[PDB]
Design a protein around this ligand. Structure first.
Ligand code: CU
Ligand code: NA
Ligand code: ZN
Ligand code: ZN
Ligand code: ZN
Ligand code: ZN
Ligand code: ZN
Ligand code: ZN
Ligand code: ZN
Ligand code: ZN
Ligand code: ZN
Length: 186
């Protein structure tokens, strides 16, 4: 089990930035999206590696409804539902070419990764994520077991605030992780 650690996924980022200080009274002001997530279910952050579905059989649109992409279709008994909130999620700056880095506690391997980015013109701070607002930026082949996976992504013509959506199909069984990372291309 794991997540995208760079550019940090929504819940990994909330954990990394606030986990040592998760009731900090400045969070509501400085990072309202993390604040509402911590208020809804702190375990969305403590269990940062648990954002998966089993048994999708590759049919992700059938199991991840529009507006529920960042929670993996309200997966894991709703633990990550707050990640579907619409608002000014904290971004990580990226260059046009950037590496998606995943950390995997179990070295499952990947059958493949799919990486999408929100289209130019889509505003993640005011619009719910939908499949129709994504553009595919990479698909990979398989990765052998490792504690870290790196996907070298290359984009051009993307500016400002976007969401990267990384889908990790693990190799040990039909299990899939759905990772939203807010990014800023500048
Ligand atoms: Cu695992
Ligand atoms: Na790592
Ligand atoms: Zn980092
Ligand atoms: Zn303020
Ligand atoms: Zn909840
Ligand atoms: Zn800022
Ligand atoms: Zn910036
Ligand atoms: Zn370039
Ligand atoms: Zn580890
Ligand atoms: Zn749709
Ligand atoms: Zn910006």
């Amino acid at each position: 089990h794991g997540s995208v650690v760079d550019p940090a996924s929504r819940n990994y980022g909330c954990w990394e930035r606030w986990g040592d200080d998760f009731q900090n009274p400045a969070m509501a002001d400085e990072d309202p999206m993390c604040w509402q997530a911590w208020q809804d279910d702190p375990n969305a952050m403590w269990n940062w590696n648990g954002l998966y579905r089993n048994g999708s059989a590759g049919d992700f649109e059938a199991v991840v409804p529009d507006g529920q992409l960042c929670s993996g279709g309200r997966t894991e008994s709703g633990r990550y539902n707050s990640l579907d909130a619409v608002g000014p999620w904290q971004t990580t700056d990226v260059t046009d070419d950037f590496t998606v880095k995943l950390h995997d506690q179990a070295s499952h391997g990947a059958d493949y990764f799919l990486v999408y980015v929100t289209k130019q013109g889509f505003d993640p701070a005011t619009q719910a994520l939908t499949w129709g607002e994504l553009q595919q930026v990479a698909r990979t082949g398989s990765y052998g077991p490792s504690q870290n996976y790196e996907i070298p992504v290359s984009t051009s013509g993307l500016t400002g605030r976007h969401v990267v959506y990384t889908i990790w199909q693990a190799s040990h069984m039909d299990q899939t992780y759905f990772l939203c990372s807010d990014v800023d291309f500048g």
